[PDB]
Design a protein around this nucleic acid. Structure first.
Lengths: 368, 732, 732
DNA sequence: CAAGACCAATCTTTACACTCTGTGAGTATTAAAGTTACCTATAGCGCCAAGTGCGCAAAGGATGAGCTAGTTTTT
């Protein structure tokens, strides 16, 4: 695609910035008054006001501009049709497994690289007189000046909406270089967000050597990215990644298996046991699911109250339905790729039957 | 043996996977490029297995750096054969050195027992990677494994269009590969001595001749394959469709006492063949297949339990597909390729197994033709076929001519199951509102048929979380349950509706059921054919029928006309004169000028009389339309037909008036009153001719057709819009 | 514009004449050798027209000494053009001196005027004779005539199986020979000067470059055709199915302003094509054909009255034939080749023009498939299709599988008209005896249907002389006419016949109507399926249905069975227990050993009860067969069904007993009791499997099937004998 | 800490300037026709003005109603 001057007027800015073209005034940047500082742990999330000119521009950019630029197949995140299961599937054919993590992936993206990457897809011209360019006007809606580090310029906040697409587009040459490096070594490589998974099917100690991590660091140093040494994992014949266990011993042409550990399914089993033990819903939605109805918003517009038994019940039903959908997704992945252990299939079938029976019992009790 | 083929980023494939291979796998579609690319991928993989230097394949996109081809072999029979204590040959022990030894020495004593449960399957995976710099890499770095896999699972490709009938190399290769004899034990000297003793006037004469020939023909020595070919030729007695049949029969027969399972690909087996010839070819293949089957009571010598080889064939003929579906049944599958929105080959499975035996027995060419379509319109009655297949109507809409219209029943729809093949073959099911709601005259309440209940149950999905655009639809579902009683009032003695128009209910039902690919017409097809805006055209068509079809029964027209005018009254007794003078005949002779004028005057008088009678006996332009619609076997408003009213015993006056009109002036239309008579085609042709005579431009005629016929034109426009939206995918 | 082609004693022809050519002539058949021979004959004739040295063709038999090829050209338009006083040119006068000069100077002043200048069609006949000594002779000894005929009626041949897309020689040949421009007026020097002026930095550089190039590349000068091709190529802006489409479109377009009428032959237009592609090809050809038509009101610029060229098709695809029949209509014909008894090619015309618009619009692939058949069986109902298309039944008779069965009504049969192509496609029409004779209960007399009267009239032959053996037919016709009253007596209250048996009359009418390719069955299909000899097999099938399909509705079988045994009596209340315990289900669960034993005991008790009631209520064992074949929508003896008897108000006791049996005990069989349900296929498969298990030899099982089912086996045997009689002729 | 390995495509080709019409020794030297491009864009829910909006989220009758929202990963 090639966005021109007319495209920004009839597609990208239909009613939010239409008054800044006839007036011949430059499009302003995002001020500090239009963003929040939501914090969770040692992370900062930059939110944006819903009633802002830039939010609709971001929506239009995501739907019409940042959805046609080609990507690399090694990226399994923030794309149409990607999933974590597709991120773990290709490595069932390997015997050695290695994992790497990128440190501060969204904070180390230089805005110059973003400007250069989107340059071929936007023509070189002037939007508002001989004062502002189209590329700069578009970039003013996808960047924010961090007040925490005044020395730094304009960065890509984590909490915006166009950030994942920009991260995928910018981190494309690195994916190509890493894939080319791994192809010559016979190593399967996949990437999800900023986590890289490497699999070796042959019997070798390449993934357990410092040479591999040194080469990956050298490749990443072109864009200034770094990998933290606190999340370096390298194992053989089995690996656990956030409860997903991939196992393959293999001597020649062997196919591994993917399952989920019991620690991954501990919470749902506890919820099922509590529900079958006639535990009241008050101590189930607050102890296991961790969903609470705060007194600051307990029907702020209604003094009738006496609706807790419905709110908690429907929240529990939503939780069980979501977990059932997750298990159904796993079953569909097994059906389409056939890389799940049979005993785990039996276990998840039993769990699904139990969950469905509990949902039916909850509905019947609510009716009665 | 091969159970999975996966291609990533090669030619026209982004990520394609093929599994579940039957014995008679069949491939159909409109994107021949995809089939050619699949054949190229398979041939490239098998050429690289044999260590041959070939050009690497191209990439789909240059934003990647690798191209993967993955093959999975079901090494179950070989594992059982080799790991048996009764087998101690060199070949078995060699096989248990590169296939089942590396993966077994790493196990322990608790899983080896679990791997011998007589119900598990052993798989071997081989992956080929092509790099950006035209480099080839393998997951297994051992040429011995590749050679063994190639010699255990050979691949045979047959081209039927450009075939040389004078070359028998595939036959000789198949014979040489499928042998159980060691030809090296034959002594050349002993055979030469035997031949020399057989033909000799003196001892030692053929040997001298052979030696003299060899002394000057000195070339490279025979290879083993050449020797076995010569022995087979000296042992046998003799050297397009026949070649392929011989290949298939020989492959089936020879692969009965050996553990080698080849894979054969056949391209266009029906090139230059009569349809009966193709049917006979498939039938002969099926008979050969069934002759060597040992299942249940069928036993004895000559019957085996050895698995059959997999056969792939691509065809463009419905006859071969029909024969394969009817004969093989459970042992076949149908693959459909198509494309994508951006452009990329797909692979889908089309349902071809039918539980009903009647459907398989009455399987014909229309069912097979349904496979080779890009848009299917399912209808129930035979009038929809007559309306949607009109040649004149389809001339103005060159987008609906690409669809196929099929008469389908409920059981036929269940057997076909179009839902399984939805992304490959889009379809629409057109029904009537009668199948959902039933109305009664005595008790003024609606009732829901079981089909409506089934649709409601399917729409009502439980075990779900909350969605913004999900509750409202459910509310409508609840409203449908509220139509369980839905007391309403009917005027004109159960003939019309005072309120509660069915148009809004039908629109809501259509909006709900658009997700299930269904459309419910407000009325019958003939209801859309004749309406308030088409009555002048119907009257003009009736007048044209009177003017043209009616002829004088007597050979002399002038004398007969004069006698009947002097016998019967021209005004009061016009009906008996018309009955006794004009008759329907295929031939329309031309009479004299005076006779033609008299006939025209009589016809005009009859037309005026009938027009006045129909305008006076019936009130407003709403009862004549209903009378005509009910006359041609139909129903209106109350969903009651003319025959159903008589059974229910209602509207005596209306039925008596209709019966009087049928046994009176409108007596020449009685043959056309019956269903499936042919009045739809004639009316459509006359209307099209009239409109194209009145209006010149090709857009004004379509606009006037839309004005006259809103419903059928709306259906055609919707189907055309869907086809155009999905045209870029289902097009070669 | 050729009218007649005659071949005598050449290749595989004895005396073959082809005439009445249309624009869209289509050639189909099984004998491809005949088509190849016809193509070779045409090519040989046109090569000898242009004075080319080719090998003479072979003789069919050596007991003759000559082989003749005769061609007739319709030289009517050219005569009108030349003989006009308005045209004064060299070519017109030369054509007159070559063609119409000799034949016109031998006529007086009376035949020329008012006898050959009004509507006459002029013909030119050319004969080529091949002698025994490979000598070639012409009927006209003038090379100029042959050259003019060749240049006025060119012949083009297209082969699509082996076609090179990189060669455009036919396109340039068509373009060069269909232009009205003289290219000799374009001087080389002025064009070179123009090109030099257009592109030059110094004057004369391009001319000097061209001269230097020519001085080195000096070869033979351009011919006229090469010059015109180069001019066309420099004028235009650019250069399997697409090539054929372009050729046809150019041929149609360029001939609208010329008096040259080419003849085109195309072989296999559908090779390697999707059915939709072939349909689109035919549709585009028809649209381009109709674009340039100026008939009646259709006038204006761009529309002409020039005749279109002749096109011949050689196809094996029903789709192309269907499209050609539907679109072109009266401007097409279908040819069938076949063979003879001793071996010789024939040519016949198959009817393809229909006067019914509904039939043309509803035309589908089955009608086209009827063309590609060697034996057609026409039936009325849908049960005949289910009976004659059974796979197991056809497995034992590998001679009826070569015939195709079609459902046709009287109007469909009239439109198809199978009698026209009787010698090419043998056919048999199977009907029931009810279509000829109608019986009544209130009035004790038979009646004859109009079809019987039409058959009698056709059989009756006035204007004839005496012939031995023809008086028997007249006597039979007189007896059929006089049997109009045929007073008889019916016993069992209008249910049976005293002594008629409906068998002698059926045999006599079959013998009479065998000459018209008709067969009247004594009873209906269901009557032949279940007869007095098939009661044990029908009872066994019912018992198997009870054993298999009936399952426990309750999820827990043991508790439900125990409760119903302790609640309902096992002997007196067996029917309510069976109704409330066992239900028909697609899935059959497996129960415990005790539960299975209890279910088997209950089923055996139910079977014993039903058989005892059946044998007690009815005694003669024939009323059992009557009730069985009447409950399955059938009529017997008196030709009466349930509805007909109820309307007639006869046999109240029998109807009440049947209703009690249906609504009391056989409630589970009811769904498999309506027409077109599927019981025929299941019963046939079960019977065939049982007999196969009992008897191993094919002869034994065939004999047992003949004994059990006499009528259908007799029909199959007669059809097989008819096919075997004509197998040699209708097989390539 | 610092490091060689820094994507694909950006529309596609094709081609001497001169004064001399056969020859050219810059301190840092592509570009103009032809020929296709192509995106492409529209209502929680209902209502009346029929999409460009307005109102409401209690019926209803123009601002009491009343009211929540799934799992996992990245992070």
């Amino acid at each position: 695609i090639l966005v021109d001057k007319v495209f920004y007027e009839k597609i990208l800015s239909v009613e939010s910035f239409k008054e800044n073209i006839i007036t011949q005034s430059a499009i302003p940047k995002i001020s500090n008054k239009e963003v929040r500082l939501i914090s969770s742990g040692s992370k900062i999330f930059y939110a944006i006001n819903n009633t802002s000119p830039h939010s609709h521009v971001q929506l239009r950019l995501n739907r019409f501009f940042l959805s046609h630029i080609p990507l690399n197949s090694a990226a399994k995140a923030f794309v149409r049709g990607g999933s974590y299961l597709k991120y773990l599937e290709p490595h069932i054919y390997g015997s050695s497994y290695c994992r790497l993590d990128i440190s501060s992936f969204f904070n180390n993206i230089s805005f110059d690289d973003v400007k250069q990457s989107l340059s071929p897809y936007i023509k070189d011209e002037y939007l508002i007189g001989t004062e502002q360019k189209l590329i700069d006007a578009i970039l003013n809606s996808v960047g924010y000046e961090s007040p925490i580090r005044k020395d730094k310029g304009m960065i890509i906040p984590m909490g915006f909406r166009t950030s994942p697409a920009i991260s995928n587009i910018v981190f494309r040459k690195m994916d190509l270089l890493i894939q080319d490096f791994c192809a010559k070594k016979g190593v399967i490589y996949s990437r999800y967000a900023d986590d890289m998974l490497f699999s070796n099917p042959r019997e070798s100690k390449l993934l357990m050597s410092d040479y591999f991590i040194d080469e990956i660091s050298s490749l990443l140093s072109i864009m200034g990215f770094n990998i933290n040494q606190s999340k370096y994992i390298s194992r053989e014949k089995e690996i656990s990644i956030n409860g997903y266990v991939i196992e393959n011993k293999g001597g020649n042409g062997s196919i591994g298996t993917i399952r989920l550990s019991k620690s991954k399914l501990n919470t749902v089993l506890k919820v099922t046991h509590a529900l079958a033990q006639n535990i009241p819903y008050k101590n189930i939605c607050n102890k296991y699911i961790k969903v609470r109805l705060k007194e600051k918003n307990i029907k702020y517009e209604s003094k009738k109250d006496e609706f807790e038994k419905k709110y908690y019940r429907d929240q529990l039903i939503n939780y069980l339905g979501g977990y059932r959908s997750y298990l159904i997704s796993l079953v569909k992945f097994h059906s389409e790729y056939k890389c799940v252990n049979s005993d785990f299939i039996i276990q998840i079938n039993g769990i699904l039957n139990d969950i469905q029976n509990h949902i039916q019992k909850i509905k019947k009790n609510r009716r009665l | 043996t091969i159970e999975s083929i996966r291609v990533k980023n090669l030619l026209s494939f982004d990520d394609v996977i093929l599994r579940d291979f039957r014995d008679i796998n069949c491939i159909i579609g409109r994107n021949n490029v995809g089939k050619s690319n699949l054949l190229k991928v398979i041939r490239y993989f098998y050429a690289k297995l044999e260590n041959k230097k070939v050009i690497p394949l191209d990439f789909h996109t240059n934003y990647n750096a690798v191209g993967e081809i993955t093959f999975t072999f079901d090494t179950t029979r070989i594992k059982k054969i080799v790991t048996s204590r009764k087998n101690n040959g060199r070949f078995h022990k060699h096989i248990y050195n590169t296939l089942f030894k590396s993966s077994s020495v790493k196990l322990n004593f608790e899983e080896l027992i679990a791997r011998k449960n007589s119900t598990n399957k052993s798989f071997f995976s081989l992956t080929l990677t092509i790099c950006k710099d035209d480099s080839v890499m393998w997951s297994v770095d051992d040429p011995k494994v590749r050679s063994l896999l190639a010699t255990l699972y050979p691949f045979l490709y047959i081209e039927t269009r450009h075939i040389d009938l004078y070359d028998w190399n595939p036959i000789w290769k198949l014979i040489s590969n499928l042998n159980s004899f060691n030809f090296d034990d034959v002594d050349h000297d002993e055979l030469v001595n035997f031949l020399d003793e057989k033909i000799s006037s003196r001892k030692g004469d053929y040997k001298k001749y052979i030696d003299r020939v060899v002394s000057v023909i000195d070339t490279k020595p025979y290879t083993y394959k050449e020797k076995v070919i010569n022995y087979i030729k000296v042992a046998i007695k003799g050297d397009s469709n026949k070649f392929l049949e011989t290949l298939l029969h020989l492959l089936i027969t020879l692969t009965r006492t050996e553990f080698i399972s080849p894979i054969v690909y056949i391209d266009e087996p029906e090139v230059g063949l009569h349809p009966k010839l193709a049917e006979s070819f498939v039938s002969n293949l099926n008979k050969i297949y069934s002759k060597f089957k040992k299942t249940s009571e069928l036993s004895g010598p000559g019957r085996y339990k050895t698995p059959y080889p997999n056969i792939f064939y691509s065809t463009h003929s419905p006859s071969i597909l029909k024969q394969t579906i009817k004969l093989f049944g459970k042992d076949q599958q149908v693959l459909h390729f198509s494309k994508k929105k951006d452009g990329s080959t797909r692979v889908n499975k089309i349902n071809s197994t039918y539980s009903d035996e009647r459907f398989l027995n009455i399987f014909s060419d229309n069912e097979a033709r349904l496979f080779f379509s890009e848009y299917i319109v399912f209808v129930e009655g035979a009038t929809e076929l007559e309306l949607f297949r009109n040649l004149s109507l389809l001339n103005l809409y060159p987008a609906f001519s690409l669809a196929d219209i099929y008469d389908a029943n409920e059981v036929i729809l269940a057997n076909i199951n179009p839902g399984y093949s939805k992304a490959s073959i889009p379809f629409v099911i057109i029904k009537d509102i009668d199948t959902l709601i039933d109305y009664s005259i005595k008790t003024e309440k609606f009732s829901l048929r079981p089909l409506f209940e089934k649709m409601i149950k399917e729409l009502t999905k439980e075990f779900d979380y909350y969605d913004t655009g999900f509750g409202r639809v459910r509310k409508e579902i609840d409203l449908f349950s509220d139509i369980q009683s839905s007391t309403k009032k009917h005027m004109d003695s159960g003939l019309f509706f005072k309120r509660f128009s069915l148009h809004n209910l039908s629109s809501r039902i259509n909006k709900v059921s658009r997700k299930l690919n269904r459309y419910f017409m407000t009325t019958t097809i003939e209801g859309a054919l004749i309406n308030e805006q088409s009555l002048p055209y119907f009257f003009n068509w009736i007048g044209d029928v009177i003017l043209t079809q009616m002829t004088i029964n007597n050979p002399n027209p002038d004398k007969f006309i004069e006698a009947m005018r002097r016998r019967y009254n021209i005004k009061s007794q016009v009906v008996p004169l018309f009955k006794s003078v004009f008759c329907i005949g295929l031939n329309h002779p031309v009479y004299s000028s005076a006779v033609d004028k008299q006939a025209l005057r009589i016809k005009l008088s009859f037309l005026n009389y009938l027009k006045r009678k129909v305008y006076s006996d019936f009130n407003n332009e709403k009862e004549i339309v209903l009378a005509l619609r009910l006359a041609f076997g139909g129903k209106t408003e109350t969903q009651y037909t003319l025959d159903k009213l008589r059974k229910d015993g209602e509207a005596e006056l209306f039925r008596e008036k209709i019966k009087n009109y049928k046994n009176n002036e409108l007596f020449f239309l009685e043959p056309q009153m019956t269903k499936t008579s042919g009045w739809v085609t004639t009316f459509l042709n006359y209307t099209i001719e009239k409109i194209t005579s009145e209006e010149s431009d090709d857009d004004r005629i379509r606009q006037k057709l839309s004005f006259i016929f809103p419903e059928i034109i709306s259906i055609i426009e919707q189907a055309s819009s869907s086809i155009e939206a999905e045209e870029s995918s289902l097009t070669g």
